[PDB]
Enzyme design. Sequence first.
Site, PDB file in Angstrom:
ATOM      1  N   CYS A 167      62.616  11.451 -12.111  1.00  0.00           N
ATOM      2  CA  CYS A 167      63.008  10.612 -10.987  1.00  0.00           C
ATOM      3  C   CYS A 167      64.366  11.057 -10.455  1.00  0.00           C
ATOM      4  O   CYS A 167      64.568  11.136  -9.248  1.00  0.00           O
ATOM      5  CB  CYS A 167      63.100   9.142 -11.411  1.00  0.00           C
ATOM      6  SG  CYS A 167      61.624   8.412 -12.127  1.00  0.00           S
ATOM      7  N   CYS A 221      64.748   7.645 -16.203  1.00  0.00           N
ATOM      8  CA  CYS A 221      63.728   8.638 -15.931  1.00  0.00           C
ATOM      9  C   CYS A 221      64.392   9.902 -15.380  1.00  0.00           C
ATOM     10  O   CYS A 221      64.953   9.895 -14.295  1.00  0.00           O
ATOM     11  CB  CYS A 221      62.698   8.028 -14.966  1.00  0.00           C
ATOM     12  SG  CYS A 221      61.602   9.151 -14.056  1.00  0.00           S
TER      13      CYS A 221
END
Length: 107
Positions: free
Chosen positions: A34, A31
Amino acid sequence: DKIIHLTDDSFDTDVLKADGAILVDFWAEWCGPCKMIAPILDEIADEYQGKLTVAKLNIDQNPGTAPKYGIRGIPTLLLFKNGDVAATKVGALSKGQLKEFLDANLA
């Protein structure tokens, strides 16, 4: 350093049984957003020491915890106050945006 690294086994102790506020970051390695926010979370741990604790749970390495808080989308920041969710933030945001979210929900 100041960030708690959660597992499925340590989540109750570290999070639900803590006497104070804990910002949990539900994230994964693939991700990109993230990873964007990860160094911002380091700064926040420093600036908000005495007010709050940052904790991270990786949803691939620990797959049991996320579906209890209904997580479907990462990064998801959940703010807890003595083990109960106070505030929810989904997706990436900036330092200043995260601060504003904290300042207003730390409450």
